[PDB]
Design a binder for these strands. Structure first.
Lengths: 314, 268
DNA sequence: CACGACCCGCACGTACGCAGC
DNA sequence: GGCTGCGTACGTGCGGGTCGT
């Protein structure tokens, strides 16, 4: 009798297995993917993608001129990403594979904390949570694209800094953080041409000029030699020192930062507006930082040029 | 790590996935695994290659970026199309953008930059554009140069909307003004040039000089904390004014050395 | 780009442990 | 106690992975 039971408990399980494995591949085609890709997905991936798709549809059901809609994605410098309050990436733009190299299917449904640097987890957790529905922060996220444009295995993944901007929306409570991530380009490898209102500069780790482009002579009036060795914190308009301190902290801790809009006092009085883009240069012998590199955008002409603010202007 | 532990972790993960799916499917809202899978399979046929359509993607992009789309020809900068979201952004109806040129819509100082940017595949710049009912706002443009209709080139870009009784002054560790905001002209009456290079004490009433010196010695030692002090100040009109100065050293974020002491002097 | 070198993942088989007509 | 459905734990086998001299 025990034998017969064991012989009728080794048969039911086979049928159950067969039915489960068949239903799972029944559920793999209904996903919105090409049949070839969906025919080779493991069971965990199928479950993940199905849950993410249902969640996203539930979202757009609460959120919800047809020939020009396809230009929106290509007209963007970056990719979209929807993250729930628990860190689950429930959608990612298809052009993600061009910025990081990880396809959408490889990411969709995974927890965000797995693909970001551990030191930044607290920041992301603070941002995702409704503590202002707007959000703006920097984070590091794994990138498998090499500088030459190749792709490498996840184990050889480097860290890429993404400027995240967006807002958190509450749906009648499910809080989903919608962000548009913009990779900040290395000053070395720049493909976008530079306007006439731009001048390059280099700094030591304490923000003391070590080289400035000659075009600063035309744009602001300072000679390149007058700035070498003088702290860049002396020239910021005192009302922007706090913002620039925050930007410097982020630049040192994370490697790259895009500054706000500040004011750099000009030679003969008055100040011009600026935006800057910072990038740390690492020494590959010891991985120790060497010198900050910057790209400066001048936004306007010298304002209040009859005024004297600092001693260096007299 | 033992194989059995890894297998048990996988089992727990799969059970969590199944529970989530059972919660998600309206019909299930507990059946076994097989029934849940079958119900999900049937449900996903009442919906529905891309995860999201184009209109939904546009909805998400507008919810994330708060911007608008516009197409402008290279040769003359003539607007060839502008989405209906330009109105909420720049309070300007579509009729004011159609037929016009891009240059008419930007601040006069940005015209050279824009003409250099549109000259002849990606493009990215920052320019100010006029607001309707001149007030200007800073907008960051991202787009690319392509042939059109789908020299015949046009830039497809999406504009993202980039987001007195007191005066601020700096000092060295001895008290010499190194930066004085222009509000000093109204607050105390001296021109900014009148104060640069002179110790703050020289303007202080003699009896309260010692308190000011003690405060300047204390704030350099507190090393980060604020320190408020009230003293009489000699104005340009030789009138003694009560003023309050809140000061705290500024320490370089990397070397932690002192750069300068910043004080926010307020007229009481 | 090879081939044993494995090491890691995954999927299946078998059986053990519980309700219940 | 039968024998049925159902879920969970351990071991084994296979293909695709990565080193290495």
């Amino acid at each position: 009798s025990s034998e017969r039971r064991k012989e009728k408990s080794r048969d039911a399980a086979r049928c159950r297995r067969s039915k489960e494995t068949e239903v799972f591949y029944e559920l793999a085609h209904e996903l919105p993917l090409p049949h070839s890709v969906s025919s080779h997905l493991d069971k965990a991936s199928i479950m993940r993608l199905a849950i993410s798709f249902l969640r996203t549809h539930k979202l757009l059901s609460s959120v919800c001129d047809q020939q020009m809609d396809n230009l929106y994605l290509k007209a963007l410098e970056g990719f979209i990403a929807v993250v729930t309050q628990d860190g689950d990436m429930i959608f990612l733009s298809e052009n993600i594979s061009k910025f990081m190299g990880l396809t959408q299917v490889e990411l969709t449904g995974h927890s965000i904390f797995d693909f970001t640097h551990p030191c930044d987890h607290e920041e992301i957790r603070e941002n995702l949570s409704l503590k202002s529905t707007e959000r703006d922060f920097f984070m590091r996220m794994k990138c498998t694209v090499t500088n030459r444009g190749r792709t490498v295995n996840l184990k050889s993944a480097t860290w890429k800094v993404l400027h995240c901007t967006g807002q958190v929306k509450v749906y009648n409570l499910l809080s989903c953080l919608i962000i548009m991530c913009e990779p900040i380009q290395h000053p070395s490898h720049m493909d976008i041409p530079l306007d006439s209102k731009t001048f390059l500069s280099r700094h030591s780790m304490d923000m003391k000029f070590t080289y400035c482009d000659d075009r600063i002579t035309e744009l602001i009036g300072y000679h390149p030699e007058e700035l070498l060795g003088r702290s860049a914190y002396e020239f910021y308009h005192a009302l922007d020192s706090e913002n620039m301190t925050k930007s410097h902290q982020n630049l040192c801790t994370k490697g790259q930062v895009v500054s706000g809009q500040y004011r750099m006092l000009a030679k003969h009085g008055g100040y011009v507006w600026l935006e800057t883009q910072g990038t740390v240069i690492y020494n590959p012998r010891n991985l120790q930082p060497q010198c900050i590199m910057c790209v400066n955008y001048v936004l306007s002409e010298i304002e209040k040029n009859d005024v004297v603010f600092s001693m260096d202007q007299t | 790590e033992n194989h059995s532990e890894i297998e048990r972790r996988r089992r727990n993960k799969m059970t969590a996935y199944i529970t989530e799916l059972s919660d998600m499917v309206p019909t299930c809202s507990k059946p076994d695994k097989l029934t849940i899978l079958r119900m999900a399979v049937s449900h996903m046929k009442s919906l529905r290659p891309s995860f999201l359509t184009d209109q939904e993607l546009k909805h998400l992009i507008l919810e994330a970026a708060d911007g608008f789309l516009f197409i402008v020809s290279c040769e003359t900068g003539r607007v060839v199309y502008v989405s209906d979201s330009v109105t909420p952004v720049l309070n300007q109806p579509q009729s004011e953008w159609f037929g016009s040129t891009l240059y008419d819509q930007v601040h006069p100082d940005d015209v050279d930059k824009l003409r250099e940017q549109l000259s002849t595949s990606r493009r990215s710049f920052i320019c100010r554009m006029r607001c309707g009912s001149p007030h200007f706002v800073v907008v960051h443009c991202t787009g690319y140069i392509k042939a059109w209709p789908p020299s015949k080139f046009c830039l497809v870009a999406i504009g993202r909307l980039q987001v007195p009784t007191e005066f601020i002054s700096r000092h060295n560790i001895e008290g010499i003004f190194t930066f004085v905001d222009h509000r000093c002209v109204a607050t105390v009456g001296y021109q900014p040039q009148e104060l640069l290079g002179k110790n703050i004490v020289e303007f202080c009433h003699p009896e309260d000089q010692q308190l000011l010196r003690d405060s300047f010695q204390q704030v350099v030692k507190l090393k980060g904390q604020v320190l408020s002090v009230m003293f009489r100040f000699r104005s340009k009109n030789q009138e003694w004014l009560w003023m309050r100065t809140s000061s705290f050293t500024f320490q370089n974020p990397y070397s932690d050395e002192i750069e300068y002491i910043i004080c926010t002097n307020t007229n009481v």
